[PDB]
Structure 1
Amino acid sequence: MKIKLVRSVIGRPGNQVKTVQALGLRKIGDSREVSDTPAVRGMVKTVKHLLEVQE
C-alpha cells in the first residue's frame, strides 16, 4: 500500500487522530510507502476515508 494524507485531522475523533499520528503523518499532503501487514492494513482501513490509498 501507498499512503497520502488528503483530509484534515480536525473535527475528527481521537482514534483516527492517533492512527494518523502512528501511521506517521504530519500535514495533509504528506505520504509514505506502507507495509502490507495486518496491523498496518488496519492502520490504513481504520482511517481509510482520510487517506488516498494508492494501490
Structure 2
Amino acid sequence: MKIKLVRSVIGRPGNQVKTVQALGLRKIGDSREVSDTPAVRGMVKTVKHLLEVQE
C-alpha cells in the first residue's frame, strides 16, 4: 500500500510506538511503500489512526 505518518508518537500508548518504529517511519511527514501481507496489514491496522494510507 502507500503509508505516511501524520500524527506523532508523543503521548501515544507503548505498543503503537514500537510499531511506528517497526514500519520504519521516524519523523512525521514520512512516507513509504508497503506489501500486502498478513503481518504487515496487521501492523498498519494497529496504528491506522496515526497514518494517512493513500489507497
More strand by share: 2
* TM superposition score normalised by structure 1: 0.96
CA-to-aligned-CA distance 1:5-50 (integer Å, 9 cap, x gap): 0001000001100110000011000010011101000010000000
TM-score of the aligned structures, taking structure 2 as reference length: 0.96
Partner SS, residue 32 of structure 2? strand
Q: Secondary structure of 2:16's match?
A: helix
1:22-41 matches, cutoff 5 A: 22-41=22-41
Unmatched tracts of structure 2, length 5 or more: none
Identity %: 100
Q: Distance in 2 between matches of 1:32 and 1:23?
A: 9
